[PDB]
Amino acid sequence: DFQDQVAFITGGASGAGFGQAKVFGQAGAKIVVADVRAEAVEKAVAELEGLGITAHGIVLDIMDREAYARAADEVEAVFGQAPTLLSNTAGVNSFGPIEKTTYDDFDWIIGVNLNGVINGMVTFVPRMIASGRPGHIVTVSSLGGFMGSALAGPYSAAKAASINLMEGYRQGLEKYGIGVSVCTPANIHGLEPEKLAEAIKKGVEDNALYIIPYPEVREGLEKHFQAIIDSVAPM
Amino acid sequence: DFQDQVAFITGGASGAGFGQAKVFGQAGAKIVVADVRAEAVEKAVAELEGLGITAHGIVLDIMDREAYARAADEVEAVFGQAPTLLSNTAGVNSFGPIEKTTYDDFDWIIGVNLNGVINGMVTFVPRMIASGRPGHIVTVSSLGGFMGSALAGPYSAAKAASINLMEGYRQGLEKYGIGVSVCTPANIHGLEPEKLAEAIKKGVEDNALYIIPYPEVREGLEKHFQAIIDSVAPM
């Protein structure tokens, strides 16, 4: 189903990233674990090889644009082609009052949750297009992307941009047979990493723009959006 | 009404920024024109003084965090207090296919339309809180912030974050008697700069979170949001 697909997953040495590695791998995908913690990568790829998944590890801070370029070359060296599946799953956060936020807070959080995915898109999109192969791109953003918050202001804002940016790339890349999705988990008891992983693989198969596997949020999302619509001036 | 209010307006040497300078100034506000084009600032402040508005010019690239800090000091030197009204109105854009986007495209566009407003918020928010005075903060974002696009991908994404970030600061700053709004013009024949300016001044008075003076967009905005809601998994 995903046999002879290559998947590049950021923040894949853990959580949702790793869940994806496992789920896509069990479906036949060759996997590339990109994560910053070198020890965790080593562990994670081993555990994948232990599951009969062919897997390669790359230690990478996605905020480094040149290293992101090296990795992408590495991927073509190892598996003889550019990825056919990109997952920007890496994420970080810290809580606290939005007023108290500092430049370092911003740089770090915006850096991972937005700039990290931009670097991903700029790096791979041309290579994926040049391959002339069908492909797909997921970004694990957040539900907080749909609604700014006082305690996760920076994080929510960056996720708000990744959602939008995916909305944009979907339109751009359809003509290239490359689908685009964005997953918006409810992180504001809680959906398990493998559960969410299966939701993403389904979304990829369905070529869904949005992946929101949380029936409970519907009410609040409707309410947040109505407030906006209601703000629209008459007549 | 705005007598003895101080207003710091980015991208105020032109367009919506300048419109605001005029509108708020005619209402009694002392004005600070912050814009990068030194000649345009000079012209703009003159034209304001010509209208009986007390006005000071500051040449400033908002992407420079330290200069943004110098300006904020300058503002307190000149008018003997931190601003009581902040407007992040500065904006830039360039059209083209989202796939073709480059790092410089991103840095420039994200830099002005997002990082510029973050620098604004980080600079002034503490000073405004420390003043112990009521205040207000507007960001002129965009309607494209509510919907990502193939031809204005970077721009739309940054505006998507500023909207969200304002959504967040509103919640944070209410306890400080500081309101927050975001204006989302329809820039995707067209509302005049002074017309839009009056809409913002009304929004400031009303302490409205959203300022969307474009009755026509309602249908499309409803449609975009429903698509999201419809993506929410049953049950």
Author numbering:
A (entry chain A), B (entry chain A): 3 to 190, 226 to 272
Provide passages from the article that reported this PDB entry.
The LigD and LigO enzymes catalyze the oxidation of the (αR)-substrates (αR,βR)-GGE and (αR,βS)-GGE, whereas LigL and LigN are specific for the α(S)-configured substrates (αS,βR)-GGE and (αS,βS)-GGE. We have solved the crystal structures of LigD, LigO, and LigL, which by amino acid sequence alignment belong to the short chain dehydrogenase/reductase (SDR) superfamily of enzymes. The SDR family is characterized as a large group of NAD(P)H (2′-phosphorylated NADH)-dependent enzymes displaying an α/β folding pattern containing a Rossman fold; this overall organization is seen in the LigD, LigO, and LigL crystal structures. The superposition of the LigD, LigO, and LigL structures using Cα atoms shows a root mean square deviation for LigD-LigO of 0.88 Å, for LigD-LigL of 0.70 Å, and for LigO-LigL of 0.93 Å, indicating that the enzymes display similar overall structural features. In these alignments, the most sequence-divergent region is in the predicted substrate binding loop. This proposed substrate binding region is disordered in all of the crystal structures solved in the apo-form (LigD, LigO, and LigL) and in the structures of the LigD·NADH and LigO·NADH complexes.
A cellular pathway has been characterized that performs β-aryl ether (β-ether)3 bond cleavage using three sequential Lig enzymes. The first step in the Lig pathway is a stereospecific oxidation of the benzylic alcohol in the GGE substrate to produce β-(2-methoxyphenoxy)-γ-hydroxypropiovanillone (MPHPV), which is catalyzed by nicotinamide adenine dinucleotide (NAD+)-dependent Cα-dehydrogenases LigD, LigL, LigN, and LigO. The final step consists of a GSH-dependent lyase, LigG, that catalyzes the elimination of the GSH thioether linkage in (βR)-GS-HPV to produce glutathione disulfide (GSSG) and γ-hydroxypropiovanillone (HPV). Our structural and biochemical studies of the enzymes in the bacterial β-aryl ether cleavage pathway reveal the features important for substrate and cofactor binding and catalysis by these Lig enzymes.
